[PDB]
A = this chain, B = another copy of it.
Amino acid sequence: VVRVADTMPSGPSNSESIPALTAAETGHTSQVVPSDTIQTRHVRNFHVRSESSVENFLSRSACVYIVEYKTRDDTPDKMYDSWVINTRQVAQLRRKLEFFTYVRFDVEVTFVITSVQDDSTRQNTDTPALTHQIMYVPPGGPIPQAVDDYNWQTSTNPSVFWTEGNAPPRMSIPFMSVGNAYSNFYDGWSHFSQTGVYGFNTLNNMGKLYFRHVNDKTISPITSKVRIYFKPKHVKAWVPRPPRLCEYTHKDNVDFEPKGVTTSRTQLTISNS
């Protein structure tokens, strides 16, 4: 229970104390309460800065990447589908996380899967319930190479089985950074000769996901689309920064084109027009 500050009463004054005059040339942000400019009354203000906390601002489920993969095709790479784990491919969740320089959050993942029946000659089938497998793979793990390859066995790796017709799956992920905070910004190279790649990409190292259909070769292909919703919680954030003005270009850098700082007025002085 923490309220905002109230308003103290004031009166007619003639003093050498000057709240209006300050030195903005020192970087000190002035602290003038409205009780020092005009004659403000007593206000018992009960506003609570509740829904502006760093926990409340970022703990909303946001999409990161759509994954599309069918259950039977002609090529083995259009069946299952993988994804390298990153939060920097959709500008909303990325732009909300790029207020800060370093953050420390646990991730709570929720998958939402929809199945679209493709068009063919024999669409009138009696199709049983589909099944989905989502195998997390740590950095350096084995590479699945087919829908029937024996690397999908999960002797150790985290996996989840879902059947269409239930609530969507949900699992939590603890803090997995090897440093102390997920670096949304890293100004440096990879090689110690100041060469290689420039990122922002040297410190991703999150691993990758994999998707496949557990069911066998069906007699009708079904386009599956799964949506990943990250939901951070227990959030601590440090050393903030202003948000991004220009639009994004890619995921592995910060590059852009220059944008005008705002939209023009075509006048400079307001009037009744």
Contacts and interface: CB of A to CB of B under 8 A. Distances in A.
Contacts of A153: 62-63, 90, 92
A117 B112 contact: no
Interface residues of A, number: 42
Contact of A125 (B93, B124, B168): B124
A123 B123 contact: no
Interface stretch (A20-28, A215-223, A235-243): A215-223
Contacts of A128: 115, 117, 127, 130, 164
A32 interface: no
Contacts of A92: 153, 155-156
Nearest to A116: B216
Given A129-B165, A165-B129, A114 B155 contact: no
Interface of A: 60-63, 90, 92-93, 96, 112, 114-117, 119, 122-131, 153-156, 161, 163-166, 168, 214-219, 223, 225
